[PDB]
């Protein structure tokens, strides 16, 4: 299986700080990601880094609310 874990699993597993640190983001964005149930998958590298991959659903609308 691929190494694309869920933001929830990795967050509750490794933590919210350890993730935001390896990703290079702010803990503020992480909380907002799970707060709104943002579907994401962070992949673990062989060097010790991690990058959050975003899905690309079907382009139906072009608006943004929350």
Curated annotation (Swiss-Prot):
Protein source organism: Escherichia phage lambda (Bacteriophage lambda)
DNA-binding positions: 16-35
Gene Ontology MF: a single term: core promoter sequence-specific DNA binding
Function, in words: Plays an essential role in the switch from lysogenic to lytic state and in fine-tuning the lytic phase activation. Mediates the de-repression of the lytic promoters from repression by cI at an early stage of prophage induction. Turns down the expression of the transcriptional activator cII, a factor that initiates the expression of repressor cI, the major component promoting latency. Additionally, cro is able to directly bind to the promoter region of cI thereby preventing the transcription of cI repressor.
Name of this chain's protein: Regulatory protein cro
Keyword Cytoplasm: no
UniProt entry keywords in alphabetical sequence: DNA-binding, Early protein, Latency-replication decision, Repressor, Transcription, Transcription regulation, Viral latency, Viral latency initiation and maintenance
Domain of life: Viruses
Subunit structure: Binds DNA as a homodimer.
A Gene Ontology BP annotation from the UniProt entry: negative regulation of transcription by competitive promoter binding
Coiled-coil ranges from the UniProt annotation: none
């Amino acid at each position: 299986m691929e190494q694309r874990i869920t933001l929830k699993d990795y967050a509750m597993r490794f933590g919210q700080t350890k993730t935001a640190k390896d990703l290079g983001v702010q803990q503020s964005a992480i909380n907002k990601w799970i707060h709104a149930g943002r579907k994401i998958f962070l992949t673990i590298n062989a060097d010790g880094s991690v990058y959050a991959e975003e899905v690309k659903p079907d382009p139906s609308n072009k608006k943004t609310t929350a």
